[PDB]
Design a protein around this ligand. Structure first.
Ligand SMILES: COc1cc2c(cc1OCCCN1CCCC1)N=C(C1CCCCC1)CN=C2NC1CCN(C(C)C)CC1
Ligand SMILES: COc1cc2c(cc1OCCCN1CCCC1)N=C(C1CCCCC1)CN=C2NC1CCN(C(C)C)CC1
Ligand SMILES: Nc1ncnc2c1ncn2[C@@H]1O[C@H](CSCC[C@H](N)C(=O)O)[C@@H](O)[C@H]1O
Ligand SMILES: Nc1ncnc2c1ncn2[C@@H]1O[C@H](CSCC[C@H](N)C(=O)O)[C@@H](O)[C@H]1O
Ligand SMILES: [Zn+2]
Ligand SMILES: [Zn+2]
Ligand SMILES: [Zn+2]
Ligand SMILES: [Zn+2]
Ligand SMILES: [Zn+2]
Ligand SMILES: [Zn+2]
Ligand SMILES: [Zn+2]
Ligand SMILES: [Zn+2]
Lengths: 260, 261
């Protein structure tokens, strides 16, 4: 019903992300800053030395098995349309290394999906029972990149002293150091995606312009055909529900719900 | 005959292809460097990227009014509706330009965003007769248009002072504090091929977009007049270059007002 914003991203995405409310009188969310890429407040010494990148020397479109970046990904998982292959392990996704600016290939090679940004037509909307949510305005085939989980990159020490923990995405411990993305104060459309026990999205760790393994980027891919109008959802995991289960129960409505 | 030796030296990284041609000799497309479309580093530079340190505007319009904070930092917004520098822009002593950024309240299509939109002109790398490779425009370029950025490897002054090849350095001079340099010898974009001209049709301008760390301005070339289709691009290398290289060769820009021949 009520169109309360024509584009919450104010033109920073390749297509607008409108916001509508047909439930109550809440206006468009405004208690955060929309950013389309990750940001920092305190410094994160991400390794950006260009000579530290692994890269490929392909002269084709990076469809051969000799592509170093495909080999780092165990294989290039992207088909001719940029969708994950049917055999992609959705239960335990691998890391994806996309091609980068040190590679000899062209900017339009096969192994570049997440770095081309959001393409699906999404919409922020007011749900009946769990606040704001995100839905697709179009059919999304299986294995399509939907959106990235974008926010403020913070250390574990910083996360342990933040009053609000509902917008944290853990980049769990590759070593002693561990970091997370906090979308509470800075974030993109993904900060409004609700939990579902049978999720139509799965997060995948991706490396594009750097390969600092402490700082993967979080890309959501569809696990099935998402029909037009369907709400997006992913599995928040057990750390969330072991903390928030004390306060409320899951309202995903799935007959296979595990937290209600 | 004009040999096409590359369809795009940028391999698709620019909005427009930049082909390379050679009607002079049998030299192939230059390949002794790595093309990058934006600045890179090898040793860390600790650029201040704290989002709360950005100055930003709160404009409710397209940032075309007098109240835009980012225009005020630039002493005024110098861009017209087409993204070109106003005729009042001081080409002889350009001010610092602060474009709008992701902390501003405005939209991504506001007026104060030109260099962050990337290269737009149709350019061409080509073999000259007595200057090696050069860059020309394939189209008319109106005055005050953003043409290309000087892109390369960001290095410190002490690193530059131990590099054997100095012909691709762009100085980021600092009146106070540490001084840095862009070296396009090993990593660079199309701008590393632009030759010196004593009456140049390009002027470099220091611009800030995603960060405002004054140690690291980005270098944007704007046209100083109409550049016609076919014309070679050129800017003034300055005195530090010619005080060093003038001992080896004379300027061949061919201008009637050449100052280094
Ligand atoms: C509530 O759900 C989480 C809560 C916490 C999480 C992650 C959580 O959900 C992750 C998935 C759900 N997301 C929702 C949107 C996107 C995915 N992560 C951290 C990190 C764990 C490992 C890496 C370093 C810190 C621990 N702290 C947590 N809450 C504490 C914070 C500090 N105190 C008080 C001082 C307020 C209370 C408890
Ligand atoms: C030859 O032209 C330059 C030469 C030098 C420059 C700048 C120059 O031209 C700038 C304009 C021309 N460009 C051409 C393309 C784009 C603009 N910069 C400096 C400093 C760098 C950072 C601190 C302030 C200035 C260093 N010295 C330089 N050559 C020395 C380097 C070390 N070797 C040996 C010790 C190995 C001795 C010569
Ligand atoms: N499946 C679910 N059941 C109940 N509440 C949920 C839920 N999924 C998400 N939420 C709510 O949404 C928060 C995650 S942030 C997701 C956006 C949120 N709906 C908003 O309006 O800002 C959780 O803290 C929880 O309060
Ligand atoms: N006006 C000029 N007169 C003589 N040589 C010039 C010149 N402008 C540029 N050059 C040459 O080009 C170098 C700058 S790098 C510019 C690209 C270069 N022509 C190339 O083929 O790689 C200078 O060191 C000088 O060798
Ligand atoms: Zn490859
Ligand atoms: Zn590659
Ligand atoms: Zn590739
Ligand atoms: Zn559930
Ligand atoms: Zn403004
Ligand atoms: Zn602004
Ligand atoms: Zn603006
Ligand atoms: Zn001259």
């Amino acid at each position: 019903e009520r169109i309360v914003s024509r584009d919450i991203a104010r033109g920073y995405e390749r297509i607008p992300i409108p916001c509508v409310n047909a439930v109550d009188s809440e206006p468009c969310p405004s208690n955060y800053k929309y950013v389309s890429q990750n940001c920092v407040t305190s410094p994160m010494n991400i390794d950006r030395n260009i000579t530290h990148l692994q890269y490929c020397v392909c002269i084709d479109d990076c469809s051969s098995s000799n592509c170093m970046c495909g080999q780092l990904s165990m294989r290039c998982w992207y088909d001719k349309d940029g969708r994950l292959l049917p055999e992609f392990n959705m239960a335990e996704p691998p890391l994806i290394f996309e091609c980068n600016h040190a590679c000899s290939c062209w900017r339009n090679c096969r192994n570049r999906v997440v770095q081309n940004g959001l393409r699906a037509r999404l919409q922020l909307y007011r749900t009946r029972d769990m606040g704001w949510g995100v839905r697709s305005l179009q059919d999304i085939p299986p294995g399509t990149f939907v959106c990235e989980y974008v926010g403020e990159l913070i250390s574990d020490s910083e996360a342990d002293v933040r009053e609000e923990d509902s917008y944290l995405f853990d980049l769990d411990n590759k070593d002693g150091e561990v970091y997370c993305i906090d979308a509470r104060f800075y974030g993109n459309v993904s900060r409004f995606i609700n939990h579902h026990c049978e999720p139509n999205l799965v997060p995948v760790r991706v490396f594009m312009a750097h390969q600092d393994l402490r700082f993967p980027r979080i890309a959501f891919f569809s696990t099935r055909l998402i029909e037009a109008g369907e709400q997006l959802g992913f599995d928040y995991g057990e750390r969330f529900w072991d903390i928030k289960g004390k306060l409320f129960s899951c309202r995903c409505g799935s007959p296979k719900c595990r937290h209600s």
